Design an enzyme around this catalytic site. Structure first.
Site: not given
Ligand SMILES: NC(=O)c1ccc[n+]([C@@H]2O[C@H](COP(=O)([O-])OP(=O)(O)OC[C@H]3O[C@@H](n4cnc5c(N)ncnc54)[C@H](OP(=O)(O)O)[C@@H]3O)[C@@H](O)[C@H]2O)c1
Ligand SMILES: O=C(O)COc1cc(Cl)ccc1C(=O)NCc1cccc([N+](=O)[O-])c1
Length: 316
Positions: A16, A19, A44, A49, A78, A111
């Site tokens: 766990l 994010g 993470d 970001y 990343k 990433h």
């Molecule tokens: N590798 C990649 O391309 C990639 C892409 C997307 C995400 N990520 C990572 O994954 C993490 C998690 O994904 P995510 O940020 O997209 O979204 P998520 O964790 O699915 O959802 C976060 C949202 O849920 C709300 N929330 C959190 N806990 C809650 C609870 N207990 N009850 C109600 N609402 C709650 C948060 O609000 P508040 O914050 O206002 O409380 C925020 O609006 C990211 O932050 C990032 O570190 C990586």
């Molecule tokens: O990527 C993340 O971790 C979360 O999403 C972010 C975060 C920020 Cl700060 C800005 C923009 C994005 C976003 O559009 N990510 C989607 C994405 C990006 C690149 C390529 C792709 N792709 O589809 O190849 C998609």
């Protein structure tokens, strides 16, 4: 249930983590402080970001306060898409290290598989809104990531948003030095990723589930979009366990032998979200949640769909 999973480098990764995408710099320092106080040891991060300095501030403080030691933390960042050229990778990693005030990362990910034109803009677009690619490829970027391990900047390397053929490309590279330790992918009841999880797990690669709550704060959300946290079927499963819907959504990937990284900046939610080691979803619950799959993606960019390495044209 075991709090950490073993990686191919011999290190253990907490299942766990916190994010930090969309955690504004004016609010993320407190979020990370609170998370460390309530037991989170995995954070993470990412350069894109735009909050790594403020994450780093929180970590430094908790280290100085004697709350945790660096060895107990698992910090992930990343490599952003504009830094895939082999000559840019080390500098990008070092910028992240500097911002986070760390001398190593536990894990560093490519990433996205797509490389973008180098420059200041994170999403360089042409005049008609297509992303401008770079002339970079996955294998050369991987080799540059391997050098980071060899120089001690990072303990493990991995990938994110790679499809199984892109993972395979790395695995099959002649002269591979390090296998990817992790593939971090979107995963939740509406995008259950059965085939890609099976693939990665069979290859000894740990999967991290991102957006486990469906990313309700994603900036391109449309009001008609499906909403996991408000799904009455999942509410009913939560009520049965006297847990919240978020807690069910975080426990779900844990029982699939995934790592999961829910984001919050709200202190009570940060604490809530960690309280998931005291109940179990039943077989029926797991089956029911898996049944909700719609192949529905939070994270995908139309502006990237023409890129040679766009990951989501393949079935998995
Ligand atoms: N590798 C990649 O391309 C990639 C892409 C997307 C995400 N990520 C990572 O994954 C993490 C998690 O994904 P995510 O940020 O997209 O979204 P998520 O964790 O699915 O959802 C976060 C949202 O849920 C709300 N929330 C959190 N806990 C809650 C609870 N207990 N009850 C109600 N609402 C709650 C948060 O609000 P508040 O914050 O206002 O409380 C925020 O609006 C990211 O932050 C990032 O570190 C990586
Ligand atoms: O990527 C993340 O971790 C979360 O999403 C972010 C975060 C920020 Cl700060 C800005 C923009 C994005 C976003 O559009 N990510 C989607 C994405 C990006 C690149 C390529 C792709 N792709 O589809 O190849 C998609």
């Amino acid at each position: 249930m075991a709090s950490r999973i073993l990686l191919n480098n011999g290190a253990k990764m907490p299942i766990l983590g916190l994010g930090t995408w969309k955690s504004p710099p004016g609010q993320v320092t407190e979020a990370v402080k609170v998370a460390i106080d309530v037991g989170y040891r995995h954070i993470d991060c990412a350069h894109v970001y735009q909050n790594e300095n403020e994450v780093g501030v929180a970590i430094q403080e908790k280290l100085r306060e004697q709350v945790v030691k660096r060895e107990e933390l698992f910090i992930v960042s990343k490599l952003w898409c504009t830094y895939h050229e082999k000559g840019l990778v080390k500098g990008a990693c070092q910028k992240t290290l500097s911002d986070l005030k760390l001398d190593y990362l536990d894990l560093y990910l490519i990433h996205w598989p797509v490389g973008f034109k180098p420059g200041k803009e994170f999403f360089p677009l042409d005049e008609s809104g297509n992303v401008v690619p770079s002339d970079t490829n996955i294998l050369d970027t991987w080799a540059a990531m391997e050098e980071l391990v060899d120089e001690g900047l990072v303990k493990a390397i991995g990938i994110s948003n790679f499809n199984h053929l892109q993972v395979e490309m790395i695995l099959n590279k002649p002269g591979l030095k390090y296998k990817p330790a992790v593939n971090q992918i979107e995963c939740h009841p509406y995008l259950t990723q059965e085939k890609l999880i099976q693939y990665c797990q069979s290859k000894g690669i740990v999967v991290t589930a991102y957006s486990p709550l469906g990313s309700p704060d994603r900036p391109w959300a449309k009001p008609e979009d499906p909403s996991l946290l408000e799904d009455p079927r999942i509410k009913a499963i939560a009520a049965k366990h006297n847990k919240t819907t978020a807690q069910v959504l975080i426990r779900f990937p844990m029982q699939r032998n995934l790592v999961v990284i829910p984001k919050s900046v709200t202190p009570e939610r940060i604490a809530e979200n960690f309280k998931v080691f005291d109940f179990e979803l039943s077989s029926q619950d797991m089956t029911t949640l898996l049944s909700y799959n719609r192949n529905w993606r939070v994270c995908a960019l139309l502006s990237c769909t023409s890129h040679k390495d766009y990951p989501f044209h393949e079935e998995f």
